[PDB]
Ligand binder design. Sequence first.
Ligand code: GTP
Ligand code: GDP
Ligand code: MG
Lengths: 58, 434, 300, 49, 430, 132
Amino acid sequence: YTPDALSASRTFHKDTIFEKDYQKHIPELGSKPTVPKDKARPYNEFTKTYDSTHMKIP
Amino acid sequence: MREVISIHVGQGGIQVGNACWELFCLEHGIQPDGQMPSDGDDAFNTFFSETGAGKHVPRAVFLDLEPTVIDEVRTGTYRQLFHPEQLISGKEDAANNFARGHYTIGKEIVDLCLDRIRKLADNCTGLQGFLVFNSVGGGTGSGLGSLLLERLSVDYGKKSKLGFTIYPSPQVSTAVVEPYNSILSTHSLLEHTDVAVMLDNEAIYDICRRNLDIERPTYTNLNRLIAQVISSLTASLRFDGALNVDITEFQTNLVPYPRIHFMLSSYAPIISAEKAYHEQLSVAEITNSAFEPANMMAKCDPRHGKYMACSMMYRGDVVPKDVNASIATIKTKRTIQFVDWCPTGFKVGINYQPPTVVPGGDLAKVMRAVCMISNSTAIAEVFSRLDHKFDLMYAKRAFVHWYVGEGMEEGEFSEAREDLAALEKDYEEVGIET
Amino acid sequence: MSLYGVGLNVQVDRIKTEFRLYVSKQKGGLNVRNLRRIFEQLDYQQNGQLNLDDFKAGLNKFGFFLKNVDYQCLLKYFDVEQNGNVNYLAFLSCISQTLNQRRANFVLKVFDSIDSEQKGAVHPFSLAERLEVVKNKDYQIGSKTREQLVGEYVAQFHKNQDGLITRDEFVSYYEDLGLGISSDQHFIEILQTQWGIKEDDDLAITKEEVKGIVKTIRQKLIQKTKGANDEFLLRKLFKEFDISNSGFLTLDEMNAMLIKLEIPIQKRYLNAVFSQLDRNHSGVIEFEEFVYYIVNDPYP
Amino acid sequence: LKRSLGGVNLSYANEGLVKFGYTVMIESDFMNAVVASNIWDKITGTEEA
Amino acid sequence: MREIVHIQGGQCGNQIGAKFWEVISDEHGIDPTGTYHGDSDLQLERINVYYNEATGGRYVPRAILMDLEPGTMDSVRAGPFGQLFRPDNFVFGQTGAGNNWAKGHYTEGAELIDSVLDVVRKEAEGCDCLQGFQITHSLGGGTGSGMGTLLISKVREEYPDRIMETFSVVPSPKVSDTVVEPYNATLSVHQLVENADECMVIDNEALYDICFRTLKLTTPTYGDLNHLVSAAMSGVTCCLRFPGQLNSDLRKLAVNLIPFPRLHFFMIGFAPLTSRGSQQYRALTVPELTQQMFDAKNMMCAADPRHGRYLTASALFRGRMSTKEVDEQMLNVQNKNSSYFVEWIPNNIKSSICDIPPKGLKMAVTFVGNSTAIQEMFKRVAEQFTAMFRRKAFLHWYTGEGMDEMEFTEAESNMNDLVSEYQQYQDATA
Amino acid sequence: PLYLTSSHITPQKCAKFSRKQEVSISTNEGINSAWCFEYMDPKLRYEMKGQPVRSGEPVLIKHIPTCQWLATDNVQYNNEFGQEFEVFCNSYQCHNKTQNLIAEKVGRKTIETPMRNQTNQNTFRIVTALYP
Ligand SMILES: Nc1nc2c(ncn2[C@@H]2O[C@H](COP(=O)(O)OP(=O)(O)OP(=O)(O)O)[C@@H](O)[C@H]2O)c(=O)[nH]1
Ligand SMILES: Nc1nc2c(ncn2[C@@H]2O[C@H](COP(=O)(O)OP(=O)(O)O)[C@@H](O)[C@H]2O)c(=O)[nH]1
Ligand SMILES: [Mg+2]
């Protein structure tokens, strides 16, 4: 009994582009970096410290 | 409202700075040219300053007496990012000699460095502190680190200073004359550094071989790991979380006495892309891995000694109840025991921002990460080994002329040795029960 | 000065550069094409020759003032037939740029957008509609005598015997205008705001980025297995999928190999590296040549 | 053998002046002999020569 | 920019330098006419180290050819790459040395050395920031061993702080071509020990052995030995001229190599070396390179290091490669060969990495070692010296120029003291 | 395309028989392909520069990166196509030395002009077609 075809014999990789699920969420190199969404520590009322009138008080 | 000034001196300092700044740029979405593509408000002021037209100048300075690496920085992919006049380059290398970089050649470059530091700091009026990077076992790096620490300690005074210093490995090393300038630099930095962090290379080699399954890692991977560590430490200053901690709350929960300011750092998880999917990555198990001694980035075995302070920072989607459960398990296990006069020494921080994976890197995408900084009495073993090396070297006065001939007197070795012996005494003395 | 030999050349080149710099600094109404139209009034008989006094008067009328030494040097260089008269045509043939490729692409696409019929020519009246609608939102479609009224936006060009505006003179006039405007960015800004068209290539792949990518892929193969190996490891994928056994790689095949070996490059960067690797331009890479480049190359 | 010994035409020279693009013979006078190349034999080198 | 200047003298010095310049010109892609024809920009960024700029974009080497007889320079000017050296860098006399140290160091050298001193001073003040000097010469010849070392003394007096290396091809007694060899050898080594920052010992028998038994080449010439010497000489300064993971200049190598001022006599080696017929059958890897590194069969000196203990050693790697395997290989070879390493200097190996390999190879290794086994040639030379000197054979030629037996006496004293301290610093223990 | 090139002499890579500089047909397109003609006689080599090269004349072939002349000998070699000799690069100049440096100092001769004769070995002939 012939072992079906030689192509039926197992190969380490196959013509499936995404051969293993391992590499489908990996970061693709030349992609532009993505700006983070609305996630950083609240800082809005402290601007009246870089307001230049803060110093020279008298 | 917060800015931190990063200093990179020595070839190791510059190589680490390149990697960490690349990670920072990727984190904040800047292109290599330093331009923002047209895409909730930034808060990248910590690392970059906006010129007014789109360009973002990093808040860093590079110092070296050997112009090769700085020339490569000015030639590589980041030419348009760095400000050209904040990359200071010398003429001749110190050639692994501490006295050359501390007494003869660095004098004509420290003035320019101070001028540029002042010019960078005048912009920062909510400045948090200074971070410094240097290889201890390198001549110019060590000498300029000592000189800059001495000058800044009197120029600014109370500003917090953290030094992520690269000590030579105990059993392996590159040079042969590293003990001399190693102890010289340690003596210099003892009273000039608020926080010191160990960065030996063989332990991170071990981490890479065991976890990342890389048989021949190079310095690039090491720098990437260090960059991930520093990003995890700093993310609290630029990303909201349940518990926020600043660099000001480090000398209060990590420095019981001013003499003891050397802390060792861990990181977790260290998982490759091929490894991430078959792991659930529980917070409890990553914490268990972090406290495992072989997961240390320093060849210091904490189960040799006591624990004084323990500060851990989480980033991702962790939950405080699981945090407390993991801490309870850590306290329950008997292989880890703290010092008698510290009932509670745990300082926990939480941040919402998950770590970002770098293209061309090797770490995988994860949803939870922990960075670790601890005080252990077992750290004295590396100092004892350096003492043994220095005794073996100084017994027959080898290499001594190479330090005598350029202006530093012979008596520095004796005082440095006495100081390090005093540190060894302090480390044991802080380890006896009342 | 001391124009003995190529002193002539170095002394006329500076005059070229200062003329260019003066026009660029003016940056406004003054256009180089105005010189061509202003010389014919002094030409009288269109012989192509003008004396030194008339040349000086014409230059002073434009507003480009020069020293007496300069005038003698220009006379010496551009008096080709040595009759003592400078050839203004020969002068204007110089000091004219051939134009940047980016500006050429922009002007060609601008012309093609109008010339939908692709006949290569354009009716002068057609340009007027765009030139006016870009400037006003309430101009409304039909004017009473719109042809003559809005022909003032046009006729800075010239028309052939048929009367259609030719692509060559279109690009020539914009080239002549782009002499005071020596900015790629600001020139593109003017053109795009004037024509109401916003398109351009984002960027071209740069050599240092190419070097970074090749260094990354060059280092990645080292990490696997042992030092002597990675050659057999690279050969083994080629054996796995090279069915015809011819020995030729392709773009998609190289993309697959990179995807197998944990390297997801952009399509554009992959095309850039492919083009850099191949000089035959056949879109095929010899496997042994690729191996030799990636593995055995002293230069980065 | 058949691929080695194929036919070929040498380009003619006008006024005996060599110009780029012609196909010419190179001959060592001291051997009184013409140079040829053996592609099938491979030199000992990583690059193919 | 931290450039170095080259001075060579004598027949052997000229022969070594001629091929060193051809090799460096080939690596930098400079044609014999002096016009750059490289491929990448890395070849031009640091070209100022060895070459000075001229009109037309051409470059000239900063080398000085110094001698008493114009025969050797006369022959070398007519060969390939003879047009690079500018004609003002040739200096020579009209008499010749006669293989006499006395005539080459007291009579003709003294009167001739003014011009060569003037030209070297001119070039040294010309260079931006001088880094150091390299010399290549022979200890068995007259003109070299005398006038070159007198130049060494004068330039050391003039520039005390600069680094100075010498490549001395000290001849062997197995097959020597000169009978007055030990005399001028001892005089040269005595004069050189107090002035040379580094010493680079070269032996002809070692080169013959390597080229015959490793290259398997049946009929080599002096050209081949010159090429090995040139490759070794270029290897030390590779990371100085080109980028790398670990930069290590000449001063760094010195400070990491010499523990004591008077122990600055080193032996070197190059790797890998293979026959053409075995290239396909050898896999070039770090273990193979480090195994070929420390083989006493590979050294360029007649001294066997297995008879002594390595005081210090250094490693110059060329070619892209990670540092892990280098680190554990160094540690492994130190652990399994602890008996051959002197104990009180643990981890006495320096390592440096440069990412630009030699053209035609992917990886390369330059080894320089300071070991106590080097004293064997000192004792053998001293024994030959005393064996002739007891009879005062050939001393009339030396005494004909005012020299007396005293200088011989303290030269023997200096050699005895050196061979004496090389024993104390091989027997000293913690 | 395949180009005729040479690379500097190395003990690692020396000729199988001649042991001298190699000549090789390779895929390299670098500077090694740079080949230049030279007119035969010693007296007029310099002044013949810039003059048209005419076929059928005795010429010299020299490499640019090495300034070495290509030549052949009665050196035996075996391949498929019968028994054949060797082609390589080498300077077959006459052995006697001449005082070029001292002539330089006096000012009688300048470097670009040659002074050493080369033997008949180095000659090469370009052959065109007989009929159009
Ligand atoms: N972790 C790490 N260490 C480095 C790196 N680069 C150099 N080192 C360390 O630095 C030591 C040698 O000093 P270098 O950094 O090469 O040079 P330097 O510190 O500027 O001092 P000089 O040698 O005098 O120029 C080595 O033993 C390394 O351990 C690096 O990129 N990462
Ligand atoms: N390796 C090598 N050694 C050489 C060469 N030429 C001469 N020598 C050595 O130089 C020694 C003779 O030195 P000598 O010519 O008298 O030195 P000089 O008097 O300074 O010119 C011999 O023992 C040779 O071994 C050469 O081309 N290669
Ligand atoms: Mg350094």
